[PDB]
């Protein structure tokens, strides 16, 4: 039922994706790469003392602090949701092979019994009302770009000046490019304006993944991660195979001379994609104003900052249901892209802009290196973008696409199973908009707090409450999917945006508190996704600019966890055993060094200004800016800190661009 076309790197269609420069040519050819990460300056992830430390600590913590999660997935007592074995990976060494991305998810969705469009007129009105509320009265803002981020296809530039030029030129030429695409002239739009081509597939480490200790054998077992081979990916699963990738790390001894202790595995690898920057810039210029609207007008549902900010909302609920979505990005439906585009056209959005947006969600994918001797293949034809990959991670509005799908999916679930008495309020577009506007502000008896695939669904006192309890019971039973749109279950150890919802004996939201996840502290400190990149001179361009700073925000982030002190003492004891040094003194030195280094980057900071004016969010973000891409937003960060990590295109250029896109 239609295999996607595939082109080797030697083909002209793949060659056209890479400009005539060293960086672009190296990106096209990059072979499978692996190696120990520099966890901290002068410390490799595979250092024998470090692995000895991880073995002792993971075993001790699991033993003394077993998971406290009830039958309904609610966390209580110690605030622990699983074992501590997730740290037992040889960081920088991936599972083999990584998956080939699916060119079409239509069969995947159909086989999972998920709908190929809105089920009812009510659902159609609600998805369309989400578009009308999110994209209406937007205000122009500067187009902010992450420092050191790549422009990907075709230039592969990491230079801010070049990126600003590309973005400004893209805002000037988006109209002409969109109009070419409306004529079916995709090759012309790409050749002239670099709008099109493909996503560039990079495989990112998920540094910690599930590991269990079999009591019968005393041997560790890593969670099997299913991967698709090339045949499966091009045929959307009609042909080829879906098999468990190998996480076995024994190979590292033979290949690299690295000692592999018992129960240490290769890391899980996830597909991540980088979009063609010239196509993303006009999308980002609309996406940022949309975020500003939803985080202000609909702050209740969408704007999440601190554990207390989340707590104030949840405490008012009679029932809180922490949901889980299976493989959100790959299941994300192309019919939603089409519905969104159709609704934007109805609202009066520039057709050329809608075409650019539509094209960004149908684009071919260039597969780099999933395994040794594999990859270097373009999936899909850039002359006529027609892929159904789901949601591409590097698309300019991915967070909004996932948020829109999921927010409506959860509301539909609440309507179907708990609140049929609210159906009469959704008769047409004006009434659907009024209802959704009220629901998103937290003014209804059914409520939610969400971000992409993470959410907590709420019920206050009223007619829907009884239904709310039946839905929770249906989720616990796990025999029937409560949604026609996505695969929904309950989260095993309910958490929202990193914070665990800690319940007491009553198991009620009113007396539950949000606490930091102690396991995430351990993941961040001992299993970072990236190395320190000590060879990258400009720290603001690194994946981890100032790692030492996270020590200063630790107490604020994790201090509320019941076992906080216990974990820090266990770390100290185990680090003494492994290195013959104080971990606390080691982190205090790193904190001092990074505080001093930070002042070189902040204009307002004198030669030794200190961290006094910085918030815990500022510190977590400076140590890990990836938190600014999934956890927080621009407004949550101090202005002088945001400038360290981002640079912008003037509001004058974006204001003119936005006026040309938006209705009258
Ligand atoms: Mn959650």
From Swiss-Prot:
Principal place of residence: virion
Top EC class of this enzyme: transferase
EC number: 2.7.7.48
Gene Ontology biological-process annotations: DNA-templated transcription; viral RNA genome replication
Record-linked PROSITE patterns: RDRP_PHAGE (PS50522)
Cofactor requirements of the protein: Mg(2+); Mn(2+)
Reaction equation(s) it catalyzes: RNA(n) + a ribonucleoside 5'-triphosphate = RNA(n+1) + diphosphate
Annotated localization: Virion
Gene Ontology MF terms: metal ion binding; nucleotide binding; RNA binding; RNA uridylyltransferase activity; RNA-directed RNA polymerase activity
InterPro entries: Cystovir_RNA-dir_pol, Cystovir_RNA-dir_pol_N, DNA/RNA_pol_sf, RNA-dir_pol_C, RNA-dir_Rpol_cat_phage
GO cellular component: virion component
KW rRNA-binding (keyword) present: no
Pfam families registered for this protein in UniProt: RdRP_1
Keywords: Magnesium, Manganese, Metal-binding, Nucleotide-binding, Nucleotidyltransferase, RNA-directed RNA polymerase, Transferase, Viral RNA replication, Virion
Domain RdRp catalytic stretches: 309-484
Residues annotated for Mg(2+) binding in this entry: 453, 490, 494
Annotated function: Rna-dependent RNA polymerase part of the packaging complex that packages the viral RNA segments, replicate them into a double-stranded form and transcribe them.
Subunit composition and interactions: Part of the packaging complex composed of RDRP, P4 and P7. Interacts with P7.
Name by which UniProt lists this protein: RNA-directed RNA polymerase
């Amino acid at each position: 039922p239609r295999r996607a076309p595939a082109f080797p790197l030697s083909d002209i269609k793949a060659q056209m994706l890479f400009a005539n420069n060293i960086k672009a040519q190296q990106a096209s050819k990059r072979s499978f790469k692996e190696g120990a990460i520099e966890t901290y300056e002068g410390l490799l992830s595979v250092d024998p003392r470090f692995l000895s430390f991880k073995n002792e600590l993971s075993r001790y913590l699991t033993d003394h602090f077993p998971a406290n999660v009830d039958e309904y997935g609610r966390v209580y007592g110690n605030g622990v949701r699983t074992n501590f074995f997730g740290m037992r990976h040889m960081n920088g060494f991936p599972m083999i092979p990584a998956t080939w991305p699916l060119a079409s998810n239509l069969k995947k969705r159909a086989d999972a019994d998920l709908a190929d469009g809105p089920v009812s007129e009510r659902d159609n009105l609600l998805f369309r009302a989400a578009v009308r509320l999110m994209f209406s009265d937007l205000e122009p803002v500067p187009l902010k770009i992450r420092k050191g981020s790549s422009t990907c296809i075709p230039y592969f530039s990491n230079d801010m000046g070049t990126k600003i030029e590309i973005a400004e030129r893209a805002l000037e030429k988006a109209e002409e490019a969109g109009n070419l695409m409306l004529q079916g002239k995709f090759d012309d739009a790409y050749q002239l304006h670099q709008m099109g081509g493909a996503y560039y597939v990079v495989y990112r480490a998920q540094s910690t993944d599930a590991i269990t200790l079999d009591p019968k054998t005393g041997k560790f077992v890593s969670k099997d991660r299913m991967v698709a081979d090339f045949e499966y990916a091009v045929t959307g699963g009609e042909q080829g195979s879906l098999f468990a990738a190998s996480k076995d790390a024994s190979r590292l001894k033979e290949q690299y001379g690295i000692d592999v202790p018992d129960g240490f595995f290769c890391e899980r690898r996830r597909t991540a994609m980088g979009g063609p920057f010239a196509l993303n810039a006009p999308i980002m210029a609309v996406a940022q104003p949309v975020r500003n609207k939803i985080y202000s007008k609909y702050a209740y549902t969408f704007h999440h900052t601190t554990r207390l900010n989340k707590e104030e909302k949840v405490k008012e609920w009679s029932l809180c249901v922490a949901t889980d979505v299976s493989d959100h990005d790959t299941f994300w439906p192309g019919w939603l892209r089409d519905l969104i585009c159709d609704e934007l056209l109805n609202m009066g959005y520039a057709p050329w802009w809608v075409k650019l947006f539509e094209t960004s969600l149908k684009l071919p994918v260039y597969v780099g290196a999933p395994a040794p001797e594999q990859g270097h293949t373009l999936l899909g034809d850039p002359s006529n973008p027609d892929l159904e990959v789901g949601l591409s991670s590097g698309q300019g509005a991915t967070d909004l696409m996932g948020t829109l799908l999921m927010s409506i999916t959860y509301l539909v679930m609440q309507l179907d199973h708990t609140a049929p008495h609210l159906n009469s309020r959704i008769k047409d577009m004006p009434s659907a908009c009024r209802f959704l506007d009220s629901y998103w502000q937290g003014h209804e008896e059914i409520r939610q707090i969400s971000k992409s695939d993470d959410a907590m669904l709420g019920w206050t006192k009223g007619r829907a409450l009884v239904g709310g309890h039946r839905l929770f019971e249906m989720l616990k039973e796990g025999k029937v999917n409560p949604s026609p749109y996505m695969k929904i279950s309950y989260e095993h150890g309910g958490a929202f945006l990193g914070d665990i919802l800690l319940y007491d004996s009553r198991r009620e939201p009113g007396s539950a508190i949000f606490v930091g996840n102690i396991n995430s502290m351990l993941n961040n400190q001992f299993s970072p996704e990236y190395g320190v990149q000590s060879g990258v001179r400009d720290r603001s361009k690194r994946k981890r600019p100032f790692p030492g700073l996270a020590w200063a925000s630790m107490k604020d982030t994790y201090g509320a966890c019941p076992i906080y002190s216990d974990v820090l003492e266990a770390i100290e004891r185990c680090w003494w055993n492994a290195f013959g040094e104080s971990y606390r003194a080691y982190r205090e030195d790193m904190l001092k060094r990074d505080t001093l280094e930070l002042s070189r980057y902040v204009a307002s900071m004198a030669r030794q200004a200190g961290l006094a004016e910085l918030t815990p969010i500022d510190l977590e973000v400076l140590a890990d800016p990836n938190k600014l891409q999934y956890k927080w937003t621009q407004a949550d960060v101090s202005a002088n800190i945001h400038e360290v990590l981002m640079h912008g295109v003037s509001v004058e250029k974006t204001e003119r661009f936005l006026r040309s896109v938006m209705p009258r």
